[PDB]
A paper describes a structure:
PmeC5 is a large modular enzyme that is characteristic of rumen B. fibrisolvens megaplasmids and plays a central role in degrading plant cell wall components and releasing methanol in the rumen environment.
The apo crystal structure of the PmeC5 catalytic domain monomer was determined to a maximum resolution of 1.33 Å, displaying well-resolved and continuous electron density for the observable mainchain and sidechains. The structure of PmeC5 was the characteristic right-handed parallel β-helical topology and active site residues of Asp231, Asp253, and Arg326 typical of the enzyme class. The N-terminal region of PmeC5 is composed of a short α-helix (α1) followed by a β-strand that aligns with and helps form the 10-turn parallel β-sheet, and the C-terminus comprises a single long loop (residues 378–423) containing two short α-helices (α2; residues 399–403, α3; residues 418–421). The structure of this catalytic domain reveals a right-handed β-helical structure with relatively simple loops forming the walls of the active site to create a relatively shallow catalytic groove when compared with other PME enzymes.
Residue numbers in the entry: 9 to 427
């Protein structure tokens, strides 16, 4: 056991050299679980996977109010005032670096590369690996400020990925620019739809409380951000990036004044769906005064595959749990789509007129109140026109009240301490 420290630092001459090392130190502290530990991280690029299994821990950028969450170099780099926590496993591949707990281990890598075979087969999607999440939060009271969480699987070939041995397995998706193992460091060819599969940046476990992200960014494509059932999490002034089902799971979440950025390519089938909610009961997601928008070429993504001023139009979501899942879009501002893509895909709005799809789990309690369309269109009458049990008039609210009478407020989506 080591002493309690309320604040510990990460950086080349700080308390700890890696974020992993700092979390491991917290596991050894003589502290009550109620005593918070803040990990104050120097700006830098941290090629690490983390399991946060310690209560009341914060990850914060040492740059404070002057933190950046900007990407650079077509996704490959970050601002010098950014803290990026990144890793690269995704569905369909096994990795010589992967250890028994499904996380990267440099010592396992060395053994496996000497042996000529991996030691652990990647399950891929699902809760065994948390969709290969970079950061898996499995504790109460977790907070983060000014951090970029990323899975690079469909963003770029990282240093560590290029040095790993990556094995295509069941479900591997690849296009025509080389197999994943053969790509060199810095390649962005993995942004293409033909290489896309599920790879989470950030996953929250189930039954967790008091999780809050502030001024963070979460970077991925398919299944970027997961949160489990009965977890309360808030994302305040964050940026969430993705394509298919990029915010998913059964958490009771608030996205307060977030940028919701479609991270898609020119490929005609590369369409985004913001939410894929999976509640069996109770409250779902509250998207409160968010901005539906797009990534930018040269900072976030490679212009080779992103040729227009916006993403093509996408959708608010596709419910994963039938009937009982819940998402509320409240006071959303929706970009106008690039005029060329608007014509091609039949939508001036960056959200398709139908709004939602039944193509995952079915219909469920998907709501919209107070939309501003920057294009000036009014697609209210078109929303979910093909749905039969949750219909347009259930979804498109004229007053800010849900079907059970609940007023749409932040507090409606926070934990009720008496149960
Ligand atoms: Mg890779
Ligand atoms: Mg597949
Ligand atoms: Mg309305
Ligand atoms: N940026
Ligand atoms: Na860890
Ligand atoms: Na799987
Ligand atoms: Na790298």
């Amino acid at each position: 056991k080591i002493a309690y420290s309320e604040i510990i630092t990460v950086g080349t001459d700080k308390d700890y050299k890696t974020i992993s090392d700092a979390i491991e130190a917290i596991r050894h502290m003589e502290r009550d679980d109620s005593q918070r530990v803040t990990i104050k991280i120097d700006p830098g690029n941290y090629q690490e996977m983390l399991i946060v299994d310690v209560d009341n821990v914060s990850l914060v950028n040492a740059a404070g109010d002057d933190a950046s969450i900007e990407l650079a170099d077509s996704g490959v780099s970050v601002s010098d005032k950014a803290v990026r926590i990144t890793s690269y496993y995704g569905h369909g591949y096994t990795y010589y670096s992967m250890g028994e707990d499904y996380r990267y281990d440099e010592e396992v890598l060395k053994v496996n590369q000497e042996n000529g075979y991996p030691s652990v087969t990647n399950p891929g999607s699902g809760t065994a690996t948390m969709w290969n999440a970079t950061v898996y939060v499995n504790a109460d009271g977790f907070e983060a400020e000014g951090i970029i969480f990323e899975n690079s699987f469909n963003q770029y070939v990282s240093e560590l990925a290029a040095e790993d041995t990556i094995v295509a397995m069941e479900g591997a998706k690849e296009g025509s620019d080389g197999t994943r193992n053969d790509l060199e460091k810095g390649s962005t060819v993995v942004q293409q739809k033909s290489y896309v599969e599920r790879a989470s940046a950030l996953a929250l476990g189930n039954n967790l409380s008091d999780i809050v992200f502030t001024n963070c960014k979460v970077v991925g494509r398919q299944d970027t951000l997961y949160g489990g059932k009965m977890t309360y999490a808030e994302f305040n002034n964050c940026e969430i990036y993705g394509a298919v089902d990029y915010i998913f799971g059964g958490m009771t979440a608030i996205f307060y004044q977030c940028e919701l950025k479609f991270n898609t390519t020119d490929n005609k089938n590369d369409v985004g769906y913001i939410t894929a909610a999976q509640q069996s009961s109770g409250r779902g997601y509250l998207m409160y005064e968010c901005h539906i928008t797009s990534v930018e070429a040269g900072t976030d993504v490679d212009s080779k595959y992103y040729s227009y001023t916006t993403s093509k139009p996408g959708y608010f979501g596709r419910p994963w749990q039938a009937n009982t899942s819940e998402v509320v879009f409240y006071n959303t501002t929706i970009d106008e789509c690039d005029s060329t893509l608007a014509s091609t895909y039949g939508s001036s709005s960056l959200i398709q007129p139908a709004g939602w799809l039944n193509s995952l789990g079915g219909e469920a309690q998907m709501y919209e109140y107070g939309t501003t369309e920057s294009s000036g269109v009014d697609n209210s009458s078109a929303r979910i026109a093909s749905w039969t049990t949750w219909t347009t008039s259930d979804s498109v609210l004229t007053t800010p009240y849900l079907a059970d009478g609940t007023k749409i407020t932040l507090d409606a989506f926070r934990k009720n301490k008496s149960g």
